[PDB]
Structure formats: structure tokens, C-alpha cells
Amino acid sequence: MPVRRGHVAPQNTFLDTIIRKFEGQSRKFIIANARVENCAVIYCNDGFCELCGYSRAEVMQRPCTCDFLHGPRTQRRAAAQIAQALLGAEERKVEIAFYRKDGSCFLCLVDVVPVKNEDGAVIMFILNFEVVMEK
Numbered sequence: 001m002p003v004r005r006g007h008v009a010p011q012n013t014f015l016d017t018i019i020r021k022f023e024g025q026s027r028k029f030i031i032a033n034a035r036v037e038n039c040a041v042i043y044c045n046d047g048f049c050e051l052c053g054y055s056r057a058e059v060m061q062r063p064c065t066c067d068f069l070h071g072p073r074t075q076r077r078a079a080a081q082i083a084q085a086l087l088g089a090e091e092r093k094v095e096i097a098f099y100r101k102d103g104s105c106f107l108c109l110v111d112v113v114p115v116k117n118e119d120g121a122v123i124m125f126i127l128n129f130e131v132v133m134e135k
Contacts, residue, residue, distance in 0.1 A: 003120070021128055032064040032125035034114055039064045039086040039125055051129055053101035064125050066112070071099025073107055082112065091122045098129070108133050 001007060020027060028047030032039055044059045052069065062068060065086050067079040074097035081094045093113045099105035108131040115124045 004118075021126075027128065027130045029126060029128040029130070030059065030064065032127065034122045034125040048129060051131065052098060064127055066096045066098075066127075066129075069098065071097055071105035073097040073099070073105040075107070085112075086125070091116070096129075098131070106131075 022029065022045075024045050024047045028051040029045045030041050030048050031043035031045075032041045040061050041059050041064055042061065044056050046056075048054075048059065049056060063086070065079075066074075066082050070079050075095075078094055078096045081092070082096065084090070085092050085094065091114055093111060095107065096110055096112065097105055097107035098110075111130045111132065112127050114122045115126045116122045
């Protein structure tokens, strides 16, 4: 179907997916205003704190643009596409590498996808920086 109208998904597992999105124990994420030109981090999870090894006071009201925290393994194409997605070219998922406060830098299959309303417009930038890899 072209849009999520008339039909409804199985709400229990559809919600379970959103639970894993905000689960904050093995998954990691931030909260940003998608409606502002500065795309700033109005709130942040303890998951991001364990991801980067920083502190919430270090992300408070910074731009959500992952370029501002790029490391020696982060691809410029990845950081650029994100900068364009927050600039408003397209709301799109991209991969990116992060670096820890301990001095280690890594690329994983990160899930950089924001949150939208029943119209499909992105009202918040919850760019879940969930590091994931295959077994």
C-alpha cells in the first residue's frame, strides 16, 4: 500500500520494534528538533553516553550532524550525506563511524533514521546511533 492508512500493522510487534528503538540498554540514541535550522540535540540517552564515552553535558543543544563528532575511520561521504539530510535534502538513513573517549574508532551498520507524524513529516530527529554488526 502507498501509505499507512486503512490497514494497521500488528501493534504488539510494531511497538516491540519501537521499544528496541528507545530500549537504552543495548541500543543507543539522541533527541533533536527537526523543525530548527540548527537541528539541535534537545535531549540524549545514556546509550549515547556508553557509545562515545563522553557526557550528556557535551551533547546538550549541539547540532545532531554526526560530522561534529567524526573520527579517523569516519567516511566524508557518510558525514556529508548526513549534513545534507539535516539540511533537508532528504530524510534518509546513512552509515557512519564513531570514536570513543578512550581513542578507538569504528564503523558499524548504524541506523540513522528520524521520527515523523501521521502525515509523514519529520517532526523530531531521533537519530538512533545504534551500532550493530552481523554474526
